[PDB]
Write a protein that binds this ligand. Structure first.
Ligand code: SF4
Ligand code: SF4
Ligand code: SF4
Ligand code: SF4
Ligand code: FES
Ligand SMILES: [Mg+2]
Ligand SMILES: [Zn+2]
Lengths: 48, 112, 29, 96, 125, 176, 230, 208, 115, 379, 97
């Protein structure tokens, strides 16, 4: 996070390079975020 | 004299009192050919007579606007020829006659 | 116990909101 | 408690499984069959029976307004245990 | 200004219904029977016109209920039986009319429960 | 009360006429619009770095459906069929029967997610909070068939998203 | 003939002597609310839901059981009768269980429909409700007596129509219960009809349990072939 | 009447009733009935032959001048001999008022087109013809406006099925979009939501 | 009695006249329709289809119904003249994608319960 | 003179041209006719509420408000004051959304295309407001026939105020780009002129009236929720051309900001739906503790509420004009008839007259100035 | 915004207004995404006594429309549907834009 950025750009995620079974160095998608971090990242809460 | 009545397509009428008087006189003449017992004739007679009285009793045009309660004497004139045309159409129609026919038994029954 | 708590404007209201047209004249004859 | 059909298909908690001659199994070739592993009947069978010393006990499912509508259960029949119609939890008076 | 022609009204050629949905369907005109699970009678006031049930089969995917007739859910409401018959006739449907069933008046007496000599005497209340 | 938007009268003195002529000949308003666009170039863009950054949402957000269950592990749905009665799009199909222990449970619970209009009526008709419309919105599909959810898919959705679904319900349930 | 003239909401109607107020209202076209009254059963007068106001009378009368008198004006939509209906539904719903989603009689309940039409829209009952133990009277009728409203319709049906005197009321006060007092099965060739006459979900069909909701089902009027009665 | 009940306006009810008197008196040849609802809506029921005359009078009279045509529609009641109910909604900016004019017709009796009185009605009337099959005489250009070209039937009639009779798909054999009889993977579920125990006694009908 | 209000005609003779005029216009149009829309049918087939459509409504014995069908056919003709339809709309009249529904009792009995 | 067919919102347009001048213009609609009105007759009133979101899909809560007002008029109930204030606040927000969309897509079709992005940033912010209140970005289904579905979350009013105190400068930037530009003037000035009498006769409403000088606004003449209480000005044009309608719409954005300020300041406390559990559902806690509340929740969500028999025509001053509904109720829980009056229908009908003696490139400007969305036109 | 002084001065000159005063991007001035619980007061009908539904039943007070001039069964001044509408005032905040 970086609170000095404007709303929307103040939180971000760097995806892993290997999730369950595929190489994810390039093929990243937003469905890879688990539900708790999904709730934190989409700004539904302030509590990670 | 004012300009730009504000309604697009509605021109400014100089000397409106004379035009109003002529139009109301034509309205009364067309009304005279309606049967005396017709409600349309008597109501329009009363309204037009009142309007002629107001226009003849007031020389100022703005005060005439507040008195006539229609605003923008130009559209008062507009309604005048509208009423004249309606009077001619109504004389041709003859709608004071009794009802053409009653509706069926349950034509206006709601619900079902 | 607890009292009513819902979305309400703050005491004294909100500050004024500009709505008038504002197109300043740069200025040169 | 997921089981397995004689043909090899998993058996859902509803007991559904295509029989041997059914062509519809072709839909699962080169793919998978969506089956929930957590069977609610087994999971509720593992819950303990509560012991409350009253003839009537109320259940809302826990959580208050986050549960189910409140219901009241009679515990006068000693042969069995009172089961909540919504939550499935079981209650009992302290016999002996 | 009036034709004064005499012929029964038949609008089948104007409604746009397919041919086989006119000469093959059999409509039923009836006052729906009161639901036996409830004692209210407000649903047995009007006349309903409905159609004959056609085949419903199983969808191979999702196992839903598939149909091939468009008139499976068409129910029409009429004030009188004559109105319904007139509508069905002018629309060219063969119909079956059932006469309205009314519960006959009954003689209820609370005092009959406590009878001196009749069998209407109730054992408990 | 009313205002006039275009009832202005241009001044006809020589200075005003010269101003209008200079505007016509030297394109002053065109240069001023150029300046507006130029100023707008030098300010920070509003673009976010999707998929590494997400658009803000709410606890009230409607997304992929789910079937919840109690803490014990028993499913909440009791086949009351109010969600199916209230569905504006008739996307829910339900079939029920007594379970092996006499419990009132569904044997079929299908949602056609190509008929659903994501109105949330189903989750606000449910008395036991069984059907919810959860936070997930990234579930695009390569075939029409995978968007016809059955009971197993919805139960898996619930068990997958339960943490955040319960957190959102906790955040929002006092408004209902 | 021997008809007598009565008024319903100020409208005149000719009725035979001995006709009750409920039937007189029926002739005009109104259905008085009811729970314990059935046409084909004897008169009970228990639920007090049919209480209606007679003009110039200080007391409401049970329209199901009171024979109508010459010259009466039955005020069916008066304030007093409406208030009586509201109070009676309050008492009926006080101890009733919150079982509507799991009850097989969800969309076809006279208690629910009459609460929506003639009762109030909220409760002021701040106590705890009661629960009574369920009985077993066979494999055909499922029995959940916590939903019973003690209309005694089943008791009258069994006593009079089925000819079987198994059902009754045991106990007194709020602790009275409908049943057999023993582990007994209620077997008769007409046993299932008590499922239909019960206005609430206390007696429901056991094979039909949980399978459908009334608004879903399509109705087809047909004939029996199980015997020659048709 | 505490805060949950809509407030009532007696003044507007009286004014609308008086104007209903006025319109009734002026045109006895066509007007059949006048009604003012509890929420202050005034509607006048007239004979079909008076459509041009009644509409022209409302628009041009110094006391009416209902110069705006808000809407024109139809209602299908199959139980009536005159099946279709044509409704005109008119607005007067001068007196800040609204009026409704109702008329009846059936499948084979045309209605006089009021495009001469209101230019607004033109498309409106087309829609009615498209949706119910009501013919309007002397219409400048009457044809379908909303349904597909070649569509047979009038969808808004009460006896038209909800999903119609035909549906479209693509056929690779003929390499074009074709129309075939409708078959549904899941049939529409018809719900019997109406309950017994009438809700509003004030609308109870006589038992005949 | 049974007095009814005319649409266009006073009796069946004028209705027949209008039907003949409409058939004249349709017969004139069929060649231009076949050529312009690039149909794969023959002008003979199009004219036979027009004849079949006109024959479908041969049993009508009411001038109001007849001239209402005439108005509908004129609407369809105006659609085809101004090329408001497409090939698909025109091609539908021929049901080339529909399996032949049998008529004999034995065939129907085998396929299903639909009479 | 040749015939052109500009086919595929989605619009088909057949025009006879002599040179560049437009001799005849004929729009063919029905490409988005789904049959909303017939489908409504098979749904209850609650089930039929979401169709109005889809009717005019740039101003959603305005359609919701019109439908709710009609159903409330037939039900003889009234919403609580706070519900009315919320309705008017979100109606003004929706008016801002619609006017941004209309003006910027008009400019885009003309060819400007920069204010489109500049103001869709603000549109995204307003969608966030919609989402916070209802969980849906555009089809909120928030305004119900008894009030509003849910109360505002505890931080919504602050964010609405923060958004609304900078929007005037965004309008100012739009005006800098468009108002005085000579190319914009020559594209819009003296194009699509309509006279007051022809505007009245043709059934026009909304800005199309006021662009010709007619002093009419349903928020001023026939106020419906809390409109009489809030003060604002009604912009009136003078020439009846596209430029005057542009100026009217921009000034309407400014007056909407004014009303939004007033609504933010004068929000009252209380409940959000009518306290009548036979029309509006009870709270979840009441439903899970009370027998009457559970019965009423069950019946309201399965069968719905019965509406007394009657027919009404309810109209509102939606951003595109007078949006009305003619609702006919037979006494059951499903509407017997629901006719929808959309101003786009009348405006597109008048397009043929308004595009007389103009170039082919002016038909685009006239269609843009009518503010035509074909969901409401076709229904 | 993290804009240098020179760029800020240039953009304010090119635009013609003060831009940092009214920025387009949302920063820490907005409300928190985690909020305290509400209390949400109850409506007027939540009384315990004097609250019979027959006194607050809006639907049951609706009546069928009153029939006037059923054709099936005095000076007489002319009347209008409503008094003529008053002229609007000219907006003494900016009568002219
Ligand atoms: S999800 Fe809820 S509303 Fe739907 S059937 Fe299950 S318990 Fe009933
Ligand atoms: S969100 Fe709406 S459309 Fe979708 S399943 Fe739920 S009730 Fe049906
Ligand atoms: S008997 Fe009726 S009121 Fe009682 S729980 Fe069952 S459905 Fe609800
Ligand atoms: S079981 Fe049913 S019928 Fe028998 S007394 Fe109880 S409520 Fe009445
Ligand atoms: S119905 Fe009369 S007291 Fe029960
Ligand atoms: Mg029962
Ligand atoms: Zn429980």
């Amino acid at each position: 996070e970086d609170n000095k950025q404007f709303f929307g750009r103040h939180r971000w995620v760097i995806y892993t390079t290997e999730m369950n079974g595929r190489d994810t160095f390039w093929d990243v998608d937003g469905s890879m975020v688990p539900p708790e971090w999904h709730r934190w990242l989409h700004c539904m809460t302030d509590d990670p | 004299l004012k300009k730009t009545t504000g309604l697009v397509g509605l021109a400014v009428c100089e000397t409106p009192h004379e035009r109003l008087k002529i139009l109301y006189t034509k309205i009364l003449d067309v009304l005279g050919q309606i049967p005396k017992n017709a409600a349309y004739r008597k109501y329009t007679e009363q309204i037009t007579n009142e309007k002629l009285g107001m226009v003849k009793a007031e020389p100022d045009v703005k005060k005439l606007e507040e008195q006539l309660q229609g605003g923008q004497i130009e559209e008062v004139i507009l309604q005048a020829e509208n009423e004249l045309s309606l009077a001619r159409k109504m004389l041709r129609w003859k709608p004071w006659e009794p009802l053409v026919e009653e509706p069926p038994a349950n034509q206006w029954k709601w619900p079902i | 116990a607890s009292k009513v708590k819902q979305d309400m404007p703050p005491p004294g209201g909100y500050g004024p909101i500009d709505y008038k047209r504002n197109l300043p004249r740069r200025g040169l004859s | 408690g997921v089981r397995t059909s004689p043909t090899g298909e998993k058996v859902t908690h509803t007991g559904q499984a295509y029989d041997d001659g059914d062509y519809r199994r072709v839909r699962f070739s080169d793919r998978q069959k969506e089956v929930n592993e957590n069977f609610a009947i087994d999971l509720i069978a593992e819950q303990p029976v509560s012991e409350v010393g009253s003839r009537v006990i109320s259940c809302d499912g826990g959580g208050g307004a986050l549960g189910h509508p409140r219901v009241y259960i009679n515990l006068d029949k000693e042969t069995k245990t009172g089961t909540c119609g919504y939550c499935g939890l079981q209650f009992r008076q302290p016999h002996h | 200004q009036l034709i004064a022609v005499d012929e029964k009204l038949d609008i089948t050629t104007l409604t746009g219904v397919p041919e086989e949905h006119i000469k093959t369907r059999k409509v039923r005109i009836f006052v729906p029977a009161r639901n036996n699970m409830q004692s209210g009678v407000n649903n047995t006031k009007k006349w309903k016109m409905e159609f004959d049930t056609r085949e419903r089969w199983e969808n191979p995917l999702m196992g839903w209920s598939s149909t091939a007739d468009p008139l499976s859910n068409l129910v029409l409401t009429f004030s009188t039986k004559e109105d319904a018959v007139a509508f069905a006739e002018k629309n060219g449907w063969s119909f079956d009319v059932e006469e309205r069933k009314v519960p006959k008046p009954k003689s209820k007496s609370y005092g009959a429960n406590f009878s001196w000599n009749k069998r209407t005497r109730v054992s408990t209340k | 009360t009313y205002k006039f938007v275009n009832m202005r009268e241009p001044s006809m003195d020589m200075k005003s006429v010269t101003d209008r002529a200079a505007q016509t000949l030297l394109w002053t308003e065109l240069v001023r619009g150029l300046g507006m666009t130029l100023s707008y170039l030098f300010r920070e863009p509003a673009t976010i770095n999707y998929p590494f950054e997400k658009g803000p949402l709410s606890p009230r957000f409607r997304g992929e459906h789910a079937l919840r269950r109690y803490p014990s592990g028993e499913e909440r749905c009791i086949a009351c069929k109010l969600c199916e009665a209230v569905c504006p799009a008739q996307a829910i199909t339900i079939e029920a029967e007594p379970r092996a222990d006499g419990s009132r449970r569904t044997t079929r619970y299908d949602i056609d997610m190509t008929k659903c209009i994501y109105c949330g009526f189903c989750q606000e008709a449910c008395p036991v909070d069984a059907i919810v419309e959860g936070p997930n919105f990234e579930f695009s599909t390569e075939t029409h068939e995978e968007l016809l959810y059955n009971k197993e898919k919805l139960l898996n959705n619930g068990d997958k998203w339960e943490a955040e679904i319960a957190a959102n319900i906790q955040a929002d349930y006092l408004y209902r | 003939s021997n008809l007598i003239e009565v008024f319903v909401d100020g409208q005149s109607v000719m009725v035979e002597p001995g006709t009750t107020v409920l039937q007189a209202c029926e002739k005009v076209g109104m259905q008085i609310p009811r729970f314990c009254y059935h046409e084909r059963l004897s008169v009970a007068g228990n639920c007090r839901m049919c209480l209606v106001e007679i003009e110039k009378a200080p007391k409401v009368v049970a329209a199901c059981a009171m024979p109508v008198m010459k010259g009466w004006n039955i005020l069916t939509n008066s304030e007093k009768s409406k208030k009586a209906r509201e109070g009676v539904m309050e008492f009926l719903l006080a101890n009733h269980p919150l079982d509507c989603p799991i009850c097989d009689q969800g969309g076809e309940c006279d208690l629910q429909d009459q609460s929506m039409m003639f009762g109030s829209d909220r409760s002021r009952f701040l106590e705890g409700k009661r629960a009574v133990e369920d009985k077993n009277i066979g494999p055909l009728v499922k029995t959940i007596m916590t939903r019973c409203i003690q209309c005694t319709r089943c008791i009258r049906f069994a006593s009079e129509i089925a000819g079987v005197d198994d059902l009754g009321t045991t106990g007194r006060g709020n602790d009275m219960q409908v049943g057999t007092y023993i582990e007994k099965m209620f077997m008769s060739e007409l046993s299932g009809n008590i499922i239909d006459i019960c206005p609430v979900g206390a007696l429901t069909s056991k094979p039909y349990a949980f399978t459908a909701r009334p608004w879903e089902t399509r109705k087809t009027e047909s004939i029996d072939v199980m015997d020659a009665v048709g | 009447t505490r805060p949950t009940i809509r407030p009532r306006n007696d003044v507007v009810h009286k004014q609308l009733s008086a104007f209903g008197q006025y319109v009734a008196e002026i045109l006895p040849k066509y007007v059949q009935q006048v009604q003012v609802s509890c929420f202050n809506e005034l509607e006048i029921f007239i004979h079909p032959d008076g459509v041009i005359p009644v509409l022209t009078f409302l628009r041009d009279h110094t006391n009416a001048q209902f110069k705006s045509l808000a809407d024109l529609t139809a209602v299908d009641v199959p139980t009536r001999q005159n099946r279709f109910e044509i409704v005109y909604n008119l607005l007067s900016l001068r007196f800040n008022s609204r009026i409704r004019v109702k008329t009846y017709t059936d499948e084979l009796t045309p209605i006089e087109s009021s495009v001469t009185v209101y230019k607004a009605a033109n498309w409106y009337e087309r829609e009615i013809w498209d949706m119910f099959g009501v013919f309007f005489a002397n219409h400048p250009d009457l044809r379908r406006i909303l349904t597909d070209y070649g569509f047979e039937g009038h969808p808004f009639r009460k006896d038209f099925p909800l999903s119609g009779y035909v549906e479209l798909r693509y056929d690779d054999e003929v390499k074009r979009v074709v129309a075939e009889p409708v078959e549904l993977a899941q049939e529409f579920r018809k719900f019997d939501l109406n309950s017994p125990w009438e809700a509003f006694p004030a609308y109870r009908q006589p038992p005949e | 009695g049974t007095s009814v209000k005319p649409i266009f005609s006073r009796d069946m003779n004028e209705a027949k006249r209008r039907v003949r005029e409409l058939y004249r216009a349709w017969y004139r149009e069929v060649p231009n329709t076949v050529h312009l829309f690039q149909l794969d049918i023959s002008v003979k087939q199009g004219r036979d289809k027009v004849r079949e459509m006109f024959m479908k409504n041969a049993h009508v014995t009411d001038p109001r119904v007849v001239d209402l069908l005439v108005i509908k056919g004129k609407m369809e003709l105006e659609e085809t003249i101004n090329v408001w339809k497409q090939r698909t709309h025109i091609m539908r009249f021929f049901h080339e994608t529909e399996a032949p529904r049998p008529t004999d009792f034995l065939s129907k009995f085998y396929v299903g319960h639909d009479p | 003179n040749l015939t052109l067919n500009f086919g595929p919102g989605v619009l088909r347009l057949v025009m006879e041209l002599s040179g560049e001048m437009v001799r005849k213009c004929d729009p063919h609609i029905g490409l988005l006719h789904r049959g909303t009105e017939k489908l409504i007759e098979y749904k209850t009133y609650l089930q039929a509420l979401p169709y109005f979101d889809r009717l005019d899909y740039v101003s959603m809560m305005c359609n919701e408000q019109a439908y709710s007002l009609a159903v409330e008029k037939l039900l003889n109930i009234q919403p609580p004051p706070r519900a009315q204030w919320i309705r008017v606040l979100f109606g003004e927000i929706t008016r801002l959304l619609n006017h941004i969309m209309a003006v910027t897509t008009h400019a885009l079709d003309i060819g400007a295309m920069t204010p489109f992005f500049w103001m869709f940033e603000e549109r995204e912010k307003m969608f966030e407001f919609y989402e916070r209140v209802s969980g849906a970005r555009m089809h909120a289904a928030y305004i119900r026939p008894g009030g509003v579905h849910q109360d505002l979350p505890l931080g919504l009013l602050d964010d609405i105020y923060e958004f609304s105190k900078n929007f005037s400068f965004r309008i100012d930037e739009l005006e800098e780009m468009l108002t005085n530009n000579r190319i914009w003037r020559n594209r819009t000035v003296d194009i699509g002129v309509v006279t007051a009498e022809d505007a009245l006769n043709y059934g026009f409403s909304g800005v199309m009236l006021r662009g010709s000088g007619i002093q009419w606004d349903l928020r001023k003449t026939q106020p419906y929720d809390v409109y009489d209480q809030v003060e604002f000005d009604v912009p009136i044009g003078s020439r009846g051309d596209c430029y005057d309608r542009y100026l009217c719409r921009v000034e309407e954005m400014r007056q909407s900001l004014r009303i939004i300020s007033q609504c933010l300041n004068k929000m009252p406390p209380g409940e959000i739906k009518v306290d009548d559990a036979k029309v509006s559902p009870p709270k979840r806690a009441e439903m899970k503790t009370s027998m009457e509340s559970l019965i009423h929740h069950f019946k309201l969500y399965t069968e719905g509420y019965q509406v007394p028999p009657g027919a009404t025509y309810t109209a509102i001053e939606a951003p595109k004009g007078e949006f009305g509904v003619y609702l006919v109720s037979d006494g059951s829980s499903r509407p017997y008839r629901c006719k929808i009056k959309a101003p786009g229908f009348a405006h597109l009908a008048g397009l043929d007259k308004m595009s007389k003696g103009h170039m082919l490139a002016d038909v685009v400007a006239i269609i843009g100035t009518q503010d035509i969305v074909f969901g409401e036109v076709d229904r | 915004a993290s804009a240098t002084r020179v760029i800020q001065l240039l953009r304010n000159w090119a635009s013609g207004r003060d831009l940092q005063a009214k920025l387009q991007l949302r920063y820490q001035e907005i409300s928190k995404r985690t909020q305290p619980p509400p209390k949400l007061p109850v409506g007027p009908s939540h009384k315990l006594s004097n609250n019979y539904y027959c006194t607050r039943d809006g639907r049951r007070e609706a009546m069928p429309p009153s029939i006037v001039m059923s054709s099936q069964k005095t000076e007489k001044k002319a009347v209008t549907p409503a008094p003529p509408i008053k002229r609007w005032e000219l907006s003494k905040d900016q009568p002219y834009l």
